[PDB]
Copies of this chain bind each other. A is one copy, B any other.
């Protein structure tokens, strides 16, 4: 119903005044809070992070004087050694080998171990060797005087097998400069900036400490920063990376979005000719001469510069913070978990029978028995099999949560449960009687008031004062029903049930065990004698559940 909707359930709690546990709780809380704040701040987990969208534009500057034997002096400018940056990469030629006046013809292949012949049996028509730029015609010819080489159809004359010139022809390229312009954007945060801001000095050159924001770089300085020789790499070529890192905060109070420049060599410094060391490619300059289609082939060596731009942009997001705080909230209950674990452990009698005698340091931890007593109440499943038995000659109570398979309840021994703090052959007292229940159910009432021979509880004065005092029982009956008037037999039955309940409460205490207790035949039949029923038999114990 509606009134049941408008309810609040609050947990019952025990507040303990202990320095140890308060100190532990506050220590836990302080450490957890400090770590939570540190993790939130260091990794900015209140921020939503967007990756960078980048555009790069480069401008290389410089000329080189080149000496090539033929000796001639020539000047190379940007139109001769570089092309506009494509795909965030730009290339600078540093060395070249040139092969003028090639024609599509038949020619002898350049002398090598493979191409050196002695007759037309060393060559096969149509042969495509992976190390040749031509197709064999099956007959081998003279390259020069004694030298005999296989004939090929190809661009002729064939390139000579020659190493890259040493020193590199454009070794002056280390004095070339490149200006890098980097445009970035965070489309989700709707923010874009660039690496060159107004006021930036435009005549500087980059230095990691002196000019760490000048976007003009001398190539030799890059190689020096990486620990490489420009002179050696310029001979066979290579690949160098220019890294631009953007760690940007777009909160207007803490706003900072500037690039960090870094350098990394990207080509493997392999010396294995099988892996094609360096960076080179073959380029054809086509031209017509005498109506004959000709080709000048250049083997180009140089350094490719890859501009690598990465990073993130962060702005405060409420949902991310809400998620993080929720992910952290459950860590504040670990103090309670740990302290309750301590209470449960140091309440074990083990921790006092063995541990404390050895480690006498841990002895004051015995207060946890009191704490556990004030914290936890233990109950059992009220199964129909549940039964409780008490012996006057003993000092504990027995939970017979087991089915009597024709065994006298006196014989069946159950679990030992402490009492709350504030003639048959199974009879050890000589005042018990055999049950009148059916033979199947006769064993439940085959119980005596004691385990070992001696006196009977029915002779105790308290038995006559509490269980059998008709005045006490009538007062109890009238307490619930002030104006109660009943017949003789009805009143006798009422007083009989009241006497059963009074005995059970006296001997077992808690109504939990009194509801499932079992009266001895001595006390049972004493009560039934004092308050008999007019006619019929007695049902006996019925489990409430």
Contacts and interface: CB of A to CB of B under 8 A. Distances in A.
Interface of A: 3, 5-19, 21-26, 35, 39, 42-43, 45, 51, 53, 55, 57, 59, 61-63, 65, 73-75, 77-80, 83-84, 86-89, 91, 104, 128, 130, 132-135, 153-155, 179, 181, 183, 185, 187, 192, 194, 196, 202-203, 239, 241, 243, 245, 264, 266-268, 272, 274-276, 279, 281-289, 295, 297, 304, 306, 308, 310, 319, 322-324, 326-331, 336, 339-340, 343, 366-367, 369-371, 374-383, 392, 422, 454-455, 457, 459-463, 475, 478-480, 482-483, 506, 545
A194 to B, nearest CB: 6
Nearest to A319: B39
Contacts of A282: 77-79
Given A326-B328, A462-B482, 9 more contacts: A11-B12, A11-B14, A12-B12, A18-B381, A84-B91, A285-B286, A326-B327, A329-B331, A457-B482
Contacts of A183: 239, 266-268
B245 A187 contact: yes
A274 B371 CA distance: 81
A14 B379 contact: yes
Most buried by B among A18, A84, A457: A84
Given A135-B65, A202-B274, A483-B460, A281 B83 contact: yes
B455 A483 contact: yes
Contact of A79 (B23, B297, B304, B459): B297
Given A55-B306, A276-B59, A17 B6 contact: yes
Contact of A327 (B128, B327, B336): B327
Most buried by B among A77, A378, A506: A77
- Majority secondary structure, A binding face: mixed
Most buried by B among A39, A306, A327, A455: A327
B3 A8 contact: no
Contact of A379 (B59, B274, B374, B422): B374
A377 B460 contact: no
B330 A326 contact: yes
A155 B73 CA distance: 12
A52 to B, nearest CB: 10
22 contacts: A6-B17, A7-B18, A8-B25, A10-B13, A10-B336, A12-B12, A12-B13, A14-B379, A16-B379, A16-B380, A55-B241, A55-B266, A57-B239, A57-B266, A59-B276, A65-B135, A75-B104, A75-B153, A77-B155, A79-B295, A87-B87, A323-B328
A241 B323 CA distance: 36
A285 B392 CA distance: 120
Contacts of A326: 327-331
Copies in the complex: 3
- List 4 A-B pairs, minimum CB-CB distance, nearest first: A87-B87, A6-B22, A8-B21, A79-B284
Contacts of A15: 7-9, 376-379
A532 to B, nearest CB: 24
A456 to B, nearest CB: 8
Nearest to A363: B545
